[PDB]
Amino acid sequence: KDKIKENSEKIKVNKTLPYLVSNVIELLDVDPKGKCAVIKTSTRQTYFLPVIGLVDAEKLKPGDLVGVNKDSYLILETLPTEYDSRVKAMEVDERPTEQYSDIGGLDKQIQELVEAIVLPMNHKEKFENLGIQPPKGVLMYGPPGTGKTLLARACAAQTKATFLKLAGPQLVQMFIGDGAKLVRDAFALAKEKAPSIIFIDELDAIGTKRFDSEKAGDREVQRTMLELLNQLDGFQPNTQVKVIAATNRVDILDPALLRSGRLDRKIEFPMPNEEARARIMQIHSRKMNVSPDVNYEELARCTDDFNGAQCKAVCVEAGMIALRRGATELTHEDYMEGILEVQAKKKANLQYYA
Amino acid sequence: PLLHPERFVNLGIEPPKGVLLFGPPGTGKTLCARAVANRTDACFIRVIGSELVQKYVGEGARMVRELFEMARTKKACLIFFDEIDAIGGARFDDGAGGDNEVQRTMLELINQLDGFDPRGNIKVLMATNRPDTLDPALMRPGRLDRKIEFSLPDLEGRTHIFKIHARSMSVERDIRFELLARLCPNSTGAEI
Amino acid sequence: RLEGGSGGDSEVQRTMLELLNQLDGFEATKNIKVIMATNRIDILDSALLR
Amino acid sequence: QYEKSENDLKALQSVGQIVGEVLKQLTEEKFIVKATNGPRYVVGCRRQLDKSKLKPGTRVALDMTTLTIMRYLPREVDPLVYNMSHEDPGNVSYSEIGGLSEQIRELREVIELPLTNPELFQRVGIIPPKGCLLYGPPGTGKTLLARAVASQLDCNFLKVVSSSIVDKYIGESARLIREMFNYARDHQPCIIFMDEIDAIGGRRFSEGTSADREIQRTLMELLNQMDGFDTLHRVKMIMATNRPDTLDPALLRPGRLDRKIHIDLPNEQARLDILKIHAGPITKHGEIDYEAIVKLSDGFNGADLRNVCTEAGMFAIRADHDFVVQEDFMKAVRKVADSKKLESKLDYKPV
Amino acid sequence: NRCFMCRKKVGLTGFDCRCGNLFCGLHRYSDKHNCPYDYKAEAAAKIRKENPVVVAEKIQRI
Amino acid sequence: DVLPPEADSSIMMLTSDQKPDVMYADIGGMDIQKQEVREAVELPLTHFELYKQIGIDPPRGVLMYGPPGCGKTMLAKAVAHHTTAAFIRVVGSEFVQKYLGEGPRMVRDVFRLAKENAPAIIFIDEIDAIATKRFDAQTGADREVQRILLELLNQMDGFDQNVNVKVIMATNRADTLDPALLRPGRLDRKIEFPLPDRRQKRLIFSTITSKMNLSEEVDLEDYVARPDKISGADINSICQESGMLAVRENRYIVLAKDFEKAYKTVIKKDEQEHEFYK
Amino acid sequence: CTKIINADSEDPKYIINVKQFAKFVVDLSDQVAPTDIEEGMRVGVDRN
């Protein structure tokens, strides 16, 4: 026990804090007879060490990150692999709250989503007793004002798997490459956190029908996008990540994007017919002091060709309008005036009618 | 809402963070910008619309990242855009080889404007002379909420602007300006 | 001309600017001339040198 | 544990070495070498390195301080390769796929046969082919076929996305191709696979952007080291794309790209066959009319029919009937077929 | 799997309202089940947390 | 100390054994330009004072260009097999490392070795990767590339007009290049490898078909009549396809059907027309 | 000056790059508190 005390004591001394990181380039084995390896430091220098150090040859593999002594150039630590800093930004940490009672006028689509994603995350035995497969990739398309962000932030708000975001233009990088690096780092990141869902918005910005395209632009975009396709479906499939995407216009995309397995289910979003309008207005008219003589059906039938956003906006403007006169509750006339403001009335003299 | 975050709580509403100005030139938008910036009491940030177009890909977006970063850092800060027509006016694709990069940048302004974990305490003021050739995505409310326009003074706005541009100068005690503005049926404050 | 202008100056149009720096002097030729023969005549800054 | 402590005690006093290459032997003890990161030096072996093995271009290990040759080592390890060498997991043989057995056999003559029985090529006296291309609509199983083929060897197969090759530096990309063909030169029966050439492929540009020049140089390295000066042996090139029309004709001429294999949508019998393929491991009833489903089945990828099998199971999960009825098949067929109102321009002319 | 406003069995097309109850597509709205929750107060509280009380530069330090 | 002049090179010439095994008579049907180049290089080692008495000024370098697969390298690959001078093959784009001036440093390394060794032959394949015309940009690249252009011209202009150093370059696109290479003194002999004719098709068919068994019931000229705009490498693909065809038939002898299938495979993808145009 | 990547457990054990020099596993000096050293941060470090 004294001896082990002394040896460990020396170990503390010669195992100091500052280390120079490097890469495990490969391993070998020389005969007269154990293992061996070769390393490249962060200083662009290669070193050959016959004695490995305070690590395990079986644990180490080609292309690893390790803490190495500066002077001795000896392996002293095994470092957890990191990703690009931009990748670290893509992580989600807030976990907002958008429970399904908040969203309206999209029951069917909601069912088709919770089917494709929620159930696979919860009851795999149901998918196995019948036993075929879970789907692969869900897409949201339609008019911009129909509400596509709501399902994303809501479902992420409810689920507890590793939700991971992504923006369209972010994949575009200054230097060529950097999209293949970025996306691959992302997918590996979700791999590290097997309960993993990735969202992508404005997918049209990267997904575009290629053609005889000249000097710039596309000449990296389709490279990154192709990295997306291959890293998504095909070579070495996986089941520990689910993909949600959303766009506005569909016609720019490529076939390989929407083939049948890169994006499994297609969900269109039609605008509120009548009761979706009336009820959405009834939903943002939840936090406002309302005079209880108000017909949301009148409101709907007078609100024509709006979206969830605009229907929200009218309910917004009405409160300030009543705040003009300092009233507390609201009036149907208030909603009417807010409708007028939202509609962007032009002028007068339109009086030679009737 | 800024100087009185009380009424909107006592009634339970959210202010329309997105304002666009428009109308004929030489009318009082710039002036409104500078005046609001006078009592801004906030990290007001100018933005010149053409400053974003650049030679390399994505770098303009990289601007936008730092923009919304300094925004989120500086609590209660204002942003002004001006003649945003250069950014994302249309999505010209019949012969899809025209403008694409500032379209992507415009998309970045889309996302970092709204979507996925909203910004918090930020206000956006824009203004253009031709608010007619813009991508409807910006036209969606929530982003561009109010559409305030500045018109041409019928007879009396020109009178009062005679009182604005004629006041800060040396003249005799025999003033009269209604006679003047009745003589200029169509003239702006700048011409005043 | 300034096509390779603000984006690096190309090291050549500047030397051209020194050329015009010298031509904008006083010679009257006296008995000295300078000939030039070139294709691609629609790119240079001959407006100033007219 | 005391034994482990002694192990680390011995492990403490081991210092690394510098890695370099042997340029030329000046004399019996004078050598010209170069550090991998820059300049060059004049060195000597110890006594008993067996200097005959030292040749111009070999790699050696140098002493850090004394700066002399110690333990000359084999070739290097090209980290754009190990991630594409021991990476692909196993796969079912080509028995899983179907409907294109003509092509299935057809690739066998260009790849498997010429190495297994090279005698016949010599008897008739004709050199075997060199490189093959795969093209067709997405989801025809292009990647899948290569998966089955690589599933045979699983050890002597390199795979490439043809998109992770780019970088931030000026060179550093062609060199990757170099060491790829040099490792593939090392192992004799090497199979190279490159998907989606159209990223790196291109055709040509009339002096566009400089990054275009980096790309085109990176391709011309392929054009060289495909035919070039050094011929190749047992080096098979498999290419995959969607539209061949956007490629370089110089790359498309025979010799480099020997044979162009055409993949197309399934016929009626092919659709029935793949349908039977995915229909295997499915808890159902003895009621399946594959024929009607194929009858409504018009122009669907293997992944498409896979999608049909998925959706039918979805309807089965609807109402929680653990079995599978036949009608859910036709319903899912109607849905999936309806979903193809967004895919135009699926064909591309060859070349 | 069933609703509470009409006992109609559903399954996976049910709803999870703030009040902890499941509903069918007809009764998912808070006005079709008398939701006893102060949406207005969670109002006056969220806006108060997201609203930055601006301060005109005055009476700062010493 | 002063080292041997050939020590610091980092690159070697054609090694003592790497002859490509391509006979000079192996290339069937390139009599004009093969022999023409052979005098273009080797002849100015045996006939020099004619160049002084008449005045010929043998060009320092030569350029080859043509469609992709007209035997462009198939010729340089053979000349190295049947010569004795020093030979150094050169990739088009190997000098593009991300360092500062390693390109021009490598050009110095090469031409110093060429001058050093003997009368030699420097071959640069795919010069189109470098010899552009467009301009000098500034990101991190066109500096390093174009400076190596300048190094190439600098050490390309001033050898001595006496050292037997033969420069051979070749690509397929003889258009996207700087005419600074198109100067008297740098490059004079310009040679294209156009497509063959009926006769050269016959020669290539003789040379190619001369290897296989070839059962005598196959008429070679019958396929020769079909013009079809074929490149030279296409023929080899033809005999390959027919050969592996008969092999697929489990047969060690070729018949005409393998050739019908031959043009039905390679010559296929030729017909798309709308009759009403004419 | 250098840039931070991440930290470790029970201890700082900070992973940092300089800008282009090299990446190290370094620790804070005693002049600082182990609170305001969050990741993605530009921090001044001793040269020795």
Ligand SMILES: Nc1ncnc2c1ncn2[C@@H]1O[C@H](COP(=O)(O)OP(=O)(O)OP(=O)(O)O)[C@@H](O)[C@H]1O
């Ligand atoms: N049915 C609805 N209920 C509530 N809000 C809605 C509804 N439809 C649209 N919205 C509003 O739309 C706003 C976000 O825009 P939307 O989700 O329509 O797509 P977007 O603006 O194009 O962004 P994305 O790129 O995420 O689609 C939200 O603030 C939300 O309030």
Ligand SMILES: Nc1ncnc2c1ncn2[C@@H]1O[C@H](COP(=O)(O)OP(=O)(O)OP(=O)(O)O)[C@@H](O)[C@H]1O
């Ligand atoms: N009502 C007014 N009162 C005082 N000054 C005015 C008025 N209208 C216009 N002006 C003057 O005319 C000029 C034009 O006004 P402003 O800059 O707001 O127009 P603008 O829309 O920004 O111009 P543009 O459309 O060309 O960008 C201002 O500098 C201002 O001094």
Ligand SMILES: Nc1ncnc2c1ncn2[C@@H]1O[C@H](COP(=O)(O)OP(=O)(O)OP(=O)(O)O)[C@@H](O)[C@H]1O
């Ligand atoms: N005269 C000929 N006789 C026989 N075969 C020929 C002849 N000319 C060309 N070929 C064929 O063409 C091939 C020569 O390679 P190729 O001409 O493609 O090289 P290259 O033109 O340098 O290629 P690239 O310039 O596109 O890199 C040989 O495999 C050969 O079968």
Ligand SMILES: Nc1ncnc2c1ncn2[C@@H]1O[C@H](COP(=O)(O)OP(=O)(O)O)[C@@H](O)[C@H]1O
């Ligand atoms: N005959 C088939 N049997 C089974 N799966 C198939 C078949 N054809 C296509 N697929 C499916 O479609 C996908 C084909 O993708 P891939 O070969 O990469 O095409 P692309 O490169 O055009 O995307 C595979 O993942 C596979 O699951």
Ligand SMILES: [Mg+2]
């Ligand atoms: Mg949205």
Ligand SMILES: [Mg+2]
């Ligand atoms: Mg203005």
Ligand SMILES: [Mg+2]
């Ligand atoms: Mg060649």
